[PDB]
Amino acid sequence: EDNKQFFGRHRWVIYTTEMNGKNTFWDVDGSMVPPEWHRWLHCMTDDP
Amino acid sequence: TQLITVDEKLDITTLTGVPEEHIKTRKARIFVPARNNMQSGVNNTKKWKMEFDTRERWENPLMGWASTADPLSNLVLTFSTKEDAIAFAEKNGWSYDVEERKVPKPKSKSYGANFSWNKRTRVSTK
Amino acid sequence: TYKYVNLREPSMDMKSVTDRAAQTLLWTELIRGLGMTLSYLFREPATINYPFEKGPLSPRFRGEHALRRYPSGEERCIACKLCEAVCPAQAITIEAEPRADGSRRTTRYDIDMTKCIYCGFCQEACPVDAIVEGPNFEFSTETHEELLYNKEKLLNNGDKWEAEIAANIQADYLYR
Amino acid sequence: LLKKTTGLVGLAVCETPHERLKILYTKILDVLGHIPKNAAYRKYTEQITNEKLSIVKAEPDVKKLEEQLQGGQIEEVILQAENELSLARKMIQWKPWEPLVEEPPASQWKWPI
Amino acid sequence: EMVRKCDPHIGLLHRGTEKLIEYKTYLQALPYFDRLDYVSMMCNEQAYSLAVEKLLNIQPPPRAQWIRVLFGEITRLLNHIMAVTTHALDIGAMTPFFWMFEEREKMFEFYERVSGARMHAAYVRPGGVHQDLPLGLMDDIYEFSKNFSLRIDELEEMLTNNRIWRNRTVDIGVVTAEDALNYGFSGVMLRGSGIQWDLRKTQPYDVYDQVEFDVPIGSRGDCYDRYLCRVEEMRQSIRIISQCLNKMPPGEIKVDDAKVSPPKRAEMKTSMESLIHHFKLYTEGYQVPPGATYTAIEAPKGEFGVYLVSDGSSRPYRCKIKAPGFAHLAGLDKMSKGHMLADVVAIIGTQDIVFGEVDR
Amino acid sequence: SNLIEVFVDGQSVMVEPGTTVLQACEKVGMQIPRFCYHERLSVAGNCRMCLVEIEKAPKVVAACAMPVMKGWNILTNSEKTKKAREGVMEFLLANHPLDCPICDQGGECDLQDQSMMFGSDRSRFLEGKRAVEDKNIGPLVKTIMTRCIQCTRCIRFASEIAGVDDLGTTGRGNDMQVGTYIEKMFMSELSGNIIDICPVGALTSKPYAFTARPWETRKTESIDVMDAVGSNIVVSTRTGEVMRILPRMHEDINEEWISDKTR
Amino acid sequence: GVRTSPTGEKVTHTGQVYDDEDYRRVRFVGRQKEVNENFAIDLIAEQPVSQVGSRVISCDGGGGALGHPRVYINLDKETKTGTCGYCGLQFRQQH
Amino acid sequence: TSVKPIFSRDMNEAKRRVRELYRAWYREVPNTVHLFQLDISVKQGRDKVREMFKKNAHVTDPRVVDLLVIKGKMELEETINVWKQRTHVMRFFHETEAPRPKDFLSKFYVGHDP
Amino acid sequence: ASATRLIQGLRNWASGRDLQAKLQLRYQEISKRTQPPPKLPVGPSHRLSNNYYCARDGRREAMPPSIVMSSQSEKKAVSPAPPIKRWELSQDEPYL
Amino acid sequence: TRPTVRPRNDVAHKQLSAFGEYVAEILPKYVQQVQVSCFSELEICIHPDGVIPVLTFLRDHSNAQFKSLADLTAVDIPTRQNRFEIVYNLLSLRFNSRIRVKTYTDELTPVESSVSVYKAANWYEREIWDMFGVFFANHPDLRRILTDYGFEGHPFRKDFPLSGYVELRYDDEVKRVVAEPVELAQEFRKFDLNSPWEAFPAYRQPPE
């Protein structure tokens, strides 16, 4: 979080380097976010 | 004058753009649709319908869906009278056959017949 | 109740005529436009860092479809075919029979996602909250038939996204 | 007073609207005399043309003539008088006061079918 | 250099929309109207809703009418941003496109918060709207509208007094008022030629007789006065949105005839009549009494009409869609004579043309 | 002729003596709603959905059973006729279970359809509904008796046309239950026609159960060949597959019934 | 509760599996047949029968307006439990 | 049976219009084969024109053949002016379509169509 | 918002407008993404009495179109409506 | 009937009825029916020989001034022997009103083109030709406007199927997009949605 950023920048993810066997160091993906954090990251809630 | 005399049968099959397969080999059915016996309502039995012969419906190899090649398989028309329907079928060159309208015959309803003195039409319960 | 855009007669005194001639010869409105473009040069841009930042969405969002369950594992769909009766694309195809314990369940539940218009009429027609339209929009495929979902794909989407789908329905069911 | 613009694009400002409206209204009545008296188009158009001509003759002002002719600007009142004249010259040729040329078929305007 | 004849060939997005409408119910044929003028989604929804409600002899509740007028003016801001910015981007000014599409992005967020879709909401329905406003939406509409005047101001700083923008639009596409009436023009195509006509004033619909706005009128019939009319219509849309946010009433958002609009999901799962009505509305749909209507609204492109014919059933029989871009693009051949090939793209910009509604 | 003159909404119509109000309204093209009335069964008069106003008469009459008197003006669309219809539909839907999605009669239900056409659009029933024990009457007719509206078309069919006399009503009041009272298996040769004449989903087809739904079926009109009667049927199909077999009305053959083999 | 054909192909909860000689197994060759392994007929069988003391009970699936329509289940049969037509939860009268 | 004509009062004027339309197509076919750069010959396209004209050779109503001449002029106008592409002109030559079974026995072998 | 006062003053000078009072980037002034649950109002037909549907039936009060003329005095000429009232110019901002 | 019923506009109903009498008695050569709907819309049903006199009257008369052609439409009703119903939606800006002018034709009788009355009609009746096949005599450039260039048939006729008769695909053999007969992988599933019970007793057609 950074609530001094503007709305859209204020929540972000740094993706892991290995998810389910795939090297995602450079191959990060929008669909690597699990559904419990997908509400918070897409700002469907204020609650992680 | 500005009115000509055409003594020919009205045939517009060249103008409708329908291919010859779906003109000369199709059989229209002109009919009043039967009442759904699941229901007592008779409002769907008021108008004349024109449908066609059902052609092949086969299975989609991918999904199992019902594939078709008949364009006229969903084509149902609605007519006020039988004669409008026959004129439309003859105008478009469709071979047709016509079922006459089936009305239910008038019934003699008597609630007193359920409680007769000497007839078999007594109800055993109510 | 009406106004006249562009019905101004300009002043023809020497002051205003020299003003307009200075605008012509010295390009004053052009420097105004350069100043406005320069003003946007020194703003923070509106660019979010996709995929590491995501665009904002509401709990009403209509993304990928999913078939849901009760809090027992029993699937909610009771084969009533309201969703394919209302589906304006006819993207939904349903077959059904009583399964081995006598329950009214589906054997087929297909949704062609390439016919689908993503309008959510199936989730508002569904009387048991079975079909919903989840928050997933990041589901582009590489082949056309991977978007022709059968019942197993939709039940996997339900099992995959239920932790989020249930919270969005929890946020939005009082408006429905 | 010399109205500077009509506001409508392509509608030129008429310098003498009163004389132009008088000429147009009397010319409408001259053309409209060639229609039979039992034709309702003649009676209705003589009625509204005589009303408009009385209003034009009875008001020397142009602004009050606009407020009581009740037809927008005075130049589009002139344009509608021209359109009525052209219509009357066409209605002489059509003769639409005659009886109905043909009855429709029996269920032609029956909705629903 | 000159253009002697300009023949637009259309039908390259003809999808047979108003034949597909005939095989679907009224609720099912509603999302075809989002896809006609696809920068004017809820306005076409509102037009079809008013057509079906005029045939059904029912009326929306007052809060639904204020939601429709609020989102119709948000839709009008969307469409005039699209109009002005693509009209500048085709002439060559590429920067206010990027400036105004961030505000257009925020209004798509308003649509997504109210419906779940960013464009094709299927929200305004026959009977009212589908669903109520989520809490805190009107505060964010206020925060948008409070700043949007500065956005229009800096767009207008970039284009209006600019000599290069004026030299592309001032003597271009002059339409006389009589030819604009004769060629079936509507909306800004009439009002730029000085015709005082707007359907929100003369033939007023949902609550437009209760909001208070001015109607911009051009003077020379050119591309530049129609540009100024669209900019001032964005100004007046901001004015109407301020009045709609202050005058929003409480109440329901559907007509409380549950034989037309669906019951709530809380009472569908509790009441027997409500479950029967939910069933028959989402499978058969509501029947419309037989008749034909021509309902027309003031869309942001002009008069958007629906000639809808009902036969008593739960599907439309005929649904002719009158659209502004059809008549405007028919008038393109007159509007470009004696001009150059560069002026033709400015004329296709001043006629706000979207080929979904041109083609159906 | 001894035809008497009656009026349906003021329109003059000459009917035979002995005509009921419903048949007199049928002669002018108006269909009075009904649940217990069926023109091939004896008249019950026990659902009160046919209640119509005769003008200058301060009481609605049961149109299925009341003979028309001479000079009556039957008001089929008057205000207290509509109040009678909405009240009786309210009482019909008071204890009726919320089963329309899991019901096979859904989409082809008389109770649904003329609740849409003649009922109100909402409920005032704030109580707990009843639940009726289901009966086992055979492998053909699925029985879910909570959906029963006690119209007694069952008992009249099995008593008069099927000739069995083994269905009835046991109990009394709101606890009145239609059934056999014993674990009996109703197996007539015509035993599947109580599926047809059940207006509600209380008697559905057990082989057809849960498989299809009426709007998506394509109704093809064909002939029975299981016997030499030539029974006229509708073969309803969905996506190239035969779903069920319903009867067609033909007054000279199978009037609107078929056998269980045909069905 | 997924089981496996002798061809190695998984069987869905419907009972669908392709035959040994059906060519349409080639769509899974080099790819996967996607089934769901949470069979609903096995999961609802794990729920215990609810003992209630009333003759008629009601069920709406839990959650109020988040479940299914509220239906009333008779429990007069002592041989068989009363099962919900929507959610499949079953009930028994304790006397 | 008193109908308003379209262009032709009787069949002789109608055949005059059929004949002039055929002349126009016959003149146009070499230009169509050239500028669309079709892979057909001029004789083959002229045989296709003769086939399309002999397809409608049974019509005895003057209004119907007036409409046939009108639609043929519209096709000609779309072909002279390059409004059609090469694909629209080659759609008269059903080349990718398989040859349909003609006799009873091959239609019996492939399926259920009569 | 994070712009330094020099860039903020330069930006306000080159635009000619005060840009910090009306920022196009959204911050903590917008509504919270988590809201309290609503309690929505019901319509006027949610009544337990005097609420018969035939007394509020919209679809059934639609009638067929009244046929004025069909083919089966000195009466005043009429118009389809009164003529449209001339619009008044804006008191708010006429551009005059 | 206050909150949910659309309120009836009696003033406009009376005004449009009086104006319908006016148009019917000025033009009795062509006017067949005049009807005002319950939601206050005026339809003039005319004989098709008076397309130009009735529309020119409504455009040019001082008590009409229907200067704007809103829409021009055919409706196909196959049970009528004059199956095409040509609908003219006119707009008066002077009197703030709308009028509907309706006439008929079959497949072979031409309607006179109304581009001499409204230049808006140029593409509309060309669309009516493209979609219905209604030929408009003495039209400037009558041809197709919306369908493909080789298209056979008129798609908005009701005997024309939803998916048509031909469909397109690219074929790599001839290096060309080709037209082949239409085959659906999933057929359009026709839904018989009509209720067997009468909905509107005021619209009941009288029996034979």
Ligand code: SF4
């Ligand atoms: S979202 Fe709409 S188009 Fe998609 S499956 Fe649901 S009802 Fe059909």
Ligand code: SF4
């Ligand atoms: S509406 Fe819901 S319960 Fe009914 S068939 Fe569709 S998904 Fe299943």
Ligand code: SF4
């Ligand atoms: S019988 Fe009719 S009203 Fe009752 S549950 Fe079945 S469909 Fe619904």
Ligand code: SF4
């Ligand atoms: S089961 Fe059906 S037919 Fe039998 S009495 Fe009950 S509602 Fe009537």
Ligand code: FES
């Ligand atoms: S129909 Fe007369 S009471 Fe049942």
Ligand SMILES: [K+]
């Ligand atoms: K039944």
Ligand SMILES: [Zn+2]
């Ligand atoms: Zn349950």
